[PDB]
Design a binder for this molecule. Sequence first.
Ligand SMILES: OC[C@H]1O[C@@](CO)(O[C@H]2O[C@H](CO)[C@@H](O)[C@H](O)[C@H]2O)[C@@H](O)[C@@H]1O
Ligand SMILES: *Nc1ccc2c(c1)Cc1ccccc1-2
Length: 580
Amino acid sequence: AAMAFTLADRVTEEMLADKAALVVEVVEENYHDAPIVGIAVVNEHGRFFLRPETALADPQFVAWLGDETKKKSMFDSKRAAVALKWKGIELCGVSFDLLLAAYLLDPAQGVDDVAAAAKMKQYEAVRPDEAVYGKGAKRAVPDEPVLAEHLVRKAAAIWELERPFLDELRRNEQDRLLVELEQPLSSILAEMEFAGVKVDTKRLEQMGKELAEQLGTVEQRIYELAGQEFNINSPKQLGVILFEKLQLPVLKKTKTGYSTSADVLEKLAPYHEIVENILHYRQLGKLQSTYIEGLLKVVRPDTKKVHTIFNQALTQTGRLSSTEPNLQNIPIRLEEGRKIRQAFVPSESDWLIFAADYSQIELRVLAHIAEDDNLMEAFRRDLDIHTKTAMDIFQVSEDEVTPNMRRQAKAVNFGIVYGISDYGLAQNLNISRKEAAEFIERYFESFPGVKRYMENIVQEAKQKGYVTTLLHRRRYLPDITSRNFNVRSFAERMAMNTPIQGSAADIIKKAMIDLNARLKEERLQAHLLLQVHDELILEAPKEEMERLCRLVPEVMEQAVTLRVPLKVDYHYGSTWYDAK
DNA sequence: GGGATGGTG
DNA sequence: TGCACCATCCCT
Ligand SMILES: OC[C@H]1O[C@@](CO)(O[C@H]2O[C@H](CO)[C@@H](O)[C@H](O)[C@H]2O)[C@@H](O)[C@@H]1O
Ligand SMILES: *Nc1ccc2c(c1)Cc1ccccc1-2
């Protein structure tokens, strides 16, 4: 039976109560400068639906929206805040965000709409957004009556579910995680996305022309070596030229056919000159398609800025993710791809890009959590951790660590952090099997605390059903007891890795909150632009660099207090690329 | 729509 | 490889 509500023509006083569930609907996935198709309000006085044109043009409503003393409960408040920012309207007083609450309670549920969240508490008096709006081409805003009842039902669910969700968070000891970390963070992310990052489009296009030339030359040399033309971008067609026409050996197979991964090509290079050209083609093409063309495609012509969206409720570990464009995977490893960063510039004249990153936060966190004496001491001496690990597992002095030894010790360190389960590890060839086990065994001898942690965390995941991070974030691991080898293994690696990666996420998130509070106290113009897991990127007047050199590192290093110190390096320059 | 590929921490 | 992600490209 339909849900009762007032389809208002104008804003009334009872619509501006001091507490309410609010829905400011933005249907476009990318909410930047997007339309708000409708508004719904549910409070002690009743349920209302308001048309955006009138609601957002109503001085009293706009003031209510900006009154921090007028509390609102919402779902994905960042989406509303940003869409409103593009309209010059400030949203304040959001005391509860159902999306963030659901995420903290169980990130595995993949909650991405009110219906999904409500279903967690056996509430189903609301439809999933996809059912209302459709998907892909079919997607569209329905007629007012249908739209209005949907937004009212979503608001009604929020109104009803706030208490139950808050009580469970309290039980889980996640109440402060929501109110003091994720929600305040939501506001900061909104400012970051709204501000955007300036792009030197001319530079990007010039690189594009050059890549097109080199690419043209390479693809031609390839057809020459292959004795025919074909779609090099097709792993299937390329696999036919390589493993059939040229007779190259099949070292790796895929659940489809011939594997042509870079690592596989790396091994085939000695057999024929075409391989290197394929690799070169792959490198240039990746840059052209994803980082030149793909990027230019999302730059706003009027401002030359890109406004990413930081999904704060997706990763299973508590990390953020970035989309359209993804600004968390801009090239840096290879010098040629690194050039791309020269296109990311300050949004104003005489401003500079400032980047600060934690040094080995995962291993420092691991040292803290595992309480390993050897590992904690290593960091207390601020030692090169990879060289130190090499010395221990290979039993040699610092002077005896060769480049390959350090490289191998580094791979071991990533392995420990990713989770050494009883069903992977090896690929990088060279004996593997018994020896890989011997090195890991050597490692656990040098770091007994880490061994204890790995065993304990797995046992704890099985006993409690989940693992937790420093700030009480959790991840349920039901497969921890699966009788399927492979499936159980994944869960074990997750139990070992999540507290590490997740705690690192907790720390940088608090640092962001602490940092913004400091920047405001200091009256600095500097502001956050991006977060890339263990680093923060900002821009500010050149006059502020010196203060930032002392302020940012300090704030980030002091976000939390661990058994080992936290270390943050920093760089700044005229472009993202120069901030090295 | 799925997999294959490759970009980041 | 093994942890956590996202975008482009084929191809059914
Ligand atoms: O607003 C981001 C927020 O919305 C969700 C759905 O509740 O994701 C939507 O928006 C993203 C940004 O455009 C898209 O990538 C995604 O496909 C779309 O469903 C949440 O996952 C997210 O936290
Ligand atoms: N995931 C992973 C696990 C173990 C090991 C590596 C990666 C590289 C390596 C080298 C030597 C011994 C053990 C491992």
